[PDB]
Design an enzyme around this catalytic site. Structure first.
Site, PDB file in Angstrom:
ATOM      1  CG  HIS A  52     -43.600  14.534 -26.040  1.00  0.00           C
ATOM      2  ND1 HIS A  52     -43.485  16.019 -25.339  1.00  0.00           N
ATOM      3  CD2 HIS A  52     -44.996  14.054 -25.557  1.00  0.00           C
ATOM      4  CE1 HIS A  52     -44.575  16.110 -24.821  1.00  0.00           C
ATOM      5  NE2 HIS A  52     -45.599  15.513 -24.823  1.00  0.00           N
ATOM      6  CG  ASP A  55     -40.482  16.709 -27.082  1.00  0.00           C
ATOM      7  OD1 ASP A  55     -41.191  17.414 -28.209  1.00  0.00           O
ATOM      8  OD2 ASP A  55     -40.805  16.531 -26.040  1.00  0.00           O
ATOM      9  CG  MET A  86     -42.658  12.479 -16.428  1.00  0.00           C
ATOM     10  SD  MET A  86     -43.014  12.985 -18.052  1.00  0.00           S
ATOM     11  CE  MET A  86     -43.612  14.601 -17.725  1.00  0.00           C
ATOM     12  CD  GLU A 179     -50.514  16.106 -18.831  1.00  0.00           C
ATOM     13  OE1 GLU A 179     -49.545  15.568 -19.006  1.00  0.00           O
ATOM     14  OE2 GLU A 179     -50.717  17.321 -19.099  1.00  0.00           O
ATOM     15  CE  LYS A 181     -55.685  20.569 -23.676  1.00  0.00           C
ATOM     16  NZ  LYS A 181     -54.780  20.754 -24.586  1.00  0.00           N
ATOM     17  CD  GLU A 215     -51.126  20.975 -18.376  1.00  0.00           C
ATOM     18  OE1 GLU A 215     -51.417  22.094 -19.337  1.00  0.00           O
ATOM     19  OE2 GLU A 215     -50.493  20.262 -18.798  1.00  0.00           O
ATOM     20  CG  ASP A 253     -53.802  23.681 -22.733  1.00  0.00           C
ATOM     21  OD1 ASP A 253     -53.442  23.987 -21.517  1.00  0.00           O
ATOM     22  OD2 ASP A 253     -52.975  22.853 -23.200  1.00  0.00           O
ATOM     23  CG  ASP A 255     -49.862  24.573 -21.966  1.00  0.00           C
ATOM     24  OD1 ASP A 255     -50.709  24.287 -21.231  1.00  0.00           O
ATOM     25  OD2 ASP A 255     -49.648  24.040 -23.010  1.00  0.00           O
TER      26      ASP A 255
HETATM   27 MG   LIG Z   1     -49.432  18.667 -19.415  1.00  0.00          MG
HETATM   28 MG   LIG Z   2     -51.827  22.461 -21.125  1.00  0.00          MG
END
Ligand SMILES: [Mg+2]
Ligand SMILES: [Mg+2]
Ligand SMILES: [Mg+2]
Ligand SMILES: [Mg+2]
Ligand SMILES: [Mg+2]
Ligand SMILES: [Mg+2]
Ligand SMILES: [Mg+2]
Ligand SMILES: [Mg+2]
Lengths: 386, 386, 386, 386
Positions: A52, A55, A86, A179, A181, A215, A253, A255
């Site tokens: 990002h 980041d 990416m 993406e 979600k 994802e 989520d 992860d």
């Molecule tokens: Mg993701």
């Molecule tokens: Mg996730």
């Protein structure tokens, strides 16, 4: 099962760099310098990293501060051979985005979100990214009246159309990936699944520029079959990128590292990706649990790649096993791949064996033999031959 | 809250006619004559009825038996003024369809499924149906290897394309609606959500002929927001039909009467349907619980329409309330409906107030006022003014 | 991985005998003679079979018809060496039980349910069963007002107390196991989880006579961790029986063969059962998918036992691996097993190292090393050493 | 619908004080002084407030700093008449608790967790709390091997037993309430549901000192029926406290204001609490969405109480309606409350009308009339008479 850059394993800076702050707890790990994460991931055999904007460049940074952060990052990429396939925008952390970026009710926020995104598209291109991901994590609502979804979808289309006009006018060789979600951090997020994202893309002005970045855990937060959704994305020609991780069912989520969570789903995913010849990055969007110190971070990151490679081997052995190939024929997977009526509609209508003389009871009595096939798949996954 | 045929409330024969057989239990009610259900539903104020081929014509029926069943049904429609706006095919009950109809691995079953469907399309047209629904309840899998989803989607496309060629060649004024369901009776069903169905339709040869027939409970079996999905379907111009019922969360398909299950979602759905001017049938795909005798069947069917009409009134009062209209402005729903950058990309890029001089902290500090708006919505739903 | 009767694998007659009728479809398989299932299961290496009264004796049977069915069954058990460790009552199929058996609102139905249960307890004892399972699949509600749950729990207690008085007065050496399920076929079922069942048992007059019979898929229908729940049941001394199968998340009860569904959960379950020395039957309550003919039935039943045995081997290798034993110490599993304050409350209160001089930051910095341990578990499960 | 302190509405300091930090976003609101929240909540008609130790006394505070914070808080309570009926410990925010407090693998952390808890028990008693809640939000695991659940339950028992010995030895008139949550922030949390908590309490040395503090949203995160679980807790005599909020199904813990989420469940909950004469605090554990400024915080808090009071009125009207009382009789709710076999076991066994002469078909044919009753409940909820 040692990964090499040839395996195209990529990690987000925010993954190994997650400090462990969750809704109920403070950070358990200090911040990682992006330069340090690049070096450590290269040592592990990763191909590249993703980021990002926020980041890599602290929010609020001066243009000169911005320059120095990018220069230091480029140096670590040059030192390591790591790529940046990416990039994406953080349109979710800062309070200004509390009602969204592209579909915030406030028009000035939507314009700001676009400008923040465009600034980072230019940086992504400079660093060599091929895919620009958009995760609208704040696009959505907790209550029914807060968000007219038809208007929000108009605003989402407008945003993506403008980004497409920007990249075209600049001549950039970059594609967009949405993406999906279903929820979290919003009560319901717009474009909640691969299907919704795919459908939306077809209404964009230049649909060819947009694909999905599904994802694992996100589709499983709606209880959906992730390999099935990837198959649909591949069938549509829209699997531009993929985020790999683990998720234990319908909950927040998690992860988890890839291979954790639903292991059989991971096996079928790898089987599909490898069989379809997916050529893109194998990107891990995961969080090392906040129970871990830095040694656990790198162990969890290593485990992501390890599990992919083990499953790749098992899925390949499955498909190469003559007993499995015979089982696929026994279950008529070969017949599924043949056209139903290549002879055409009129021939079908005149074909008495298709209705008037079709023996439905004899066809009904045929076993599909799927359980034998699935146990062969289980045996292969577990390394119990087959 | 008395319904009239003008409200366009429709019921499937299989709804009030459900005998109460579930995976663990025998029928608790005798079979209803379709003629009797038409008469009873007309008395309740329904507009019309819908049918699977096998609800109306027993499977295996002779052409003369078929003729007599249709004649008796037509007579009851003529006696009652009831319409048949929608019809569908049963491609799920008979054992021959145990691995699907359109995407069965066995090619001969797929051809049979098409011919059974076409035969009923002709009947639907004869009875005046405008919408032909396809619920591929057996299209899917319990195991990963049983179904190559890319090939299955090829077969699904082939099937729908052939149906579209059939209706075009016959000159029929009928459109198709795909009804998504995530699972049950298959472990995972293909095209599991509104989004997946929408995306799939765009790959058909004649996408204009196909829309969706979403069901309240089906989207809620994936934990999704049903009004959000309907909004996306409306935005795409694809809400051709709708199935209304209730569902208490992620579990087996309950098919509760409409208004049961997630009541707030029902309120927001009605708000949306009425605000968007959805003109199609309000169809109830529900099951009177097997605890009920026939008096409970009709009470549950009546309750479907009653709850719609109550929610319609509350949603209308909500939208008409000046305090709510002011609250929508306070939450900037008006701003959500204005274009983000009608001035265009170059103007956005040159607009310093959109980035360089945007005061992100002042924008971040603005409250969205959504909780006040949502409590006004709650007050209106509950009839506590507002 | 060949099972022997020494592995104590048991199957319900209704499992391999399931004809494939689901909420949307007719039977795909003919009925199996119980005598035939006993013979086929013995050939596969099963230890024994279980039955509902109505699986073995058709409902409505004469006393002489009942006698002949039992005699033929006993003969097949004598011919095969198969045991009957568990029996149960069908209080769910017949329409009379549409609102429950023990907690039906109608008092006469509740008395009938008790008498039907007692009749079968006598048969179970005669056939040598040690455990009598109660699955109250119809105990519950679809709507809030239909069932006062406090009164229903009074009726449930009354029923189980009376059964306990019956078995005590008869001198029977048989214990009861309550099988929880959260929903299906009722919208919500009473005693929905292992925890609820455990809590309820403590309010029975003779709690020592009652344990739980948890089912893998049932706990996973509430998204719960099945090994965790089994651990709690073992900790309480109440794991009297166990039903093994597979389930892909929160959806309808799939009753997949064991090992299917959540494979990692299956691994941790086997690890726990074997480590705790659970001595009871390993019973499979599963359904061969209705896609299968009889050869698939036996292949699926075989796969149940195969997967247990593979996981047993992997879990044993995991626990025996010195690298894993060192990892468990690194994660302080040894410390978890030591008492927190065997020195007692006053010593804890006076211990300054426990608060006033406890260095919370140094303790906070210690990594738990759980991801390394979990990857060792993954490697062992997949047969990639460790 | 104006609340008064007589309604016993209580709020946690951490509820209105939530700054809006979620897993993906920074705070959107400044910190609230606890003194300010007490004053604002009193103005809204709240009865009292609750606190974690760390909400009231910043972690790491000196004994004199601690004294000044408590003095200022007491002054605001004296100024407002607000009570503190409940207190709890924060054993989840600080990194030292990343693997739990009472069941952390590290023994020194478990001893610290106990000492931190005891220190706050003394403060709670001083401030007049009657109930001390324990939410073990970090007790659990993300992976199977990290936590031996039998040992963890031993450590949990040990902890609660020691707390019970402490309060007994001090003569404190305070009871403990365990608050279950299935997951979040741990992948699976120990004692995940009301049932598990109830079962666990029965194994404590002094079970009379412990009850449950169920939360609406937590049970709904496992898809369970919250009124059913409360009914079981009431039946067990263990509903010591209750946390009220809203939750839209199986997803992350939303902590919506009460009445949001599952509205029908809220209606049935209020019906039950009021009908059972629950006398304890009506405590709201909710989060004003981070979209809101401070005016939205107070509007959301106000809405909690408003919705309770509206539902109380509707549930009372439902129960008082003679048409509903007749409907309850029609559905045999009266019969559910009568003993099944007060005549005793032998009389039941000899009663031929209970089996040999029971007409199962006539009983099976009786409709339960539940849908009529549920529509009367719907009409009452919506204020459409009944
Ligand atoms: Mg993701
Ligand atoms: Mg996730
Ligand atoms: Mg349905
Ligand atoms: Mg439907
Ligand atoms: Mg089951
Ligand atoms: Mg079972
Ligand atoms: Mg909560
Ligand atoms: Mg709480």
């Amino acid at each position: 099962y040692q990964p090499t850059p040839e395996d195209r394993f990529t990690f987000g800076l925010w993954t190994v760099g997650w400090q462990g702050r969750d809704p109920f707890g403070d950070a358990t790990r200090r911040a990682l310098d992006p330069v340090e994460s690049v070096r450590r991931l290269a040592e592990l055999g990763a191909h590249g990293v993703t980021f990002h904007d926020d980041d890599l460049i602290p929010f609020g940074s001066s243009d000169s501060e911005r320059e120095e952060h990018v220069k230091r990052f480029r140096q670590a990429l040059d030192d390591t051979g790591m790529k940046v396939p990416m990039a994406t925008t953080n349109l979710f952390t800062h309070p200004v985005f509390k009602d969204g970026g592209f579909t915030a009710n406030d028009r000035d926020v939507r314009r700001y979100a676009l400008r923040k995104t465009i600034r980072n598209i230019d940086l992504a291109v400079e660093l060599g990214a091929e895919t620009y991901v958009a995760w609208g994590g704040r696009e959505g609502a907790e209550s029914g009246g807060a968000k007219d979804v038809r208007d929000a979808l108009d605003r989402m289309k407008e945003a993506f159309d403008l980004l497409g006009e920007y990249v075209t006018s600049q001549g950039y060789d970059i594609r967009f990936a949405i993406e999906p979600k279903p929820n979290e951090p919003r009560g319901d997020i717009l474009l909640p699944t691969v299907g919704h994202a795919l459908a939306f893309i077809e209404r964009l002005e230049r649909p060819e520029l947009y694909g999905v970045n599904p994802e694992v855990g996100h589709e499983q937060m709606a209880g959906l079959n992730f390999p099935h959704g990837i198959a649909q994305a591949l069938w549509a020609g829209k699997l531009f990128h993929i985020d790999l991780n683990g998720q234990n069912g319908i909950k927040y989520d998690q992860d988890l590292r890839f291979g954790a969570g639903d292991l059989r789903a991971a096996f079928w995913l790898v089987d599909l990706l490898e069989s379809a010849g997916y050529s893109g990055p194998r990107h891990f969007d995961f969080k090392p649990p906040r129970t871990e110190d830095f040694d656990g971070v790198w162990a969890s990151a290593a485990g992501c790649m390890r599990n992919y490679l083990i499953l790749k081997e098992r899925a390949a052995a499955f498909r190469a096993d003559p007993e499995v190939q015979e089982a696929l024929r026994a279950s008529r997977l070969d017949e599924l791949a043949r056209p139903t009526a290549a002879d055409g509609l009129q021939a079908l209508l005149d074909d008495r064996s298709a209705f008037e003389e079709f023996d439905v009871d004899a066809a009904a009595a045929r076993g599909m033999a799927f359980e034998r096939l699935d146990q062969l798949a289980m045996d292969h996954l577990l390394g119990a031959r087959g």
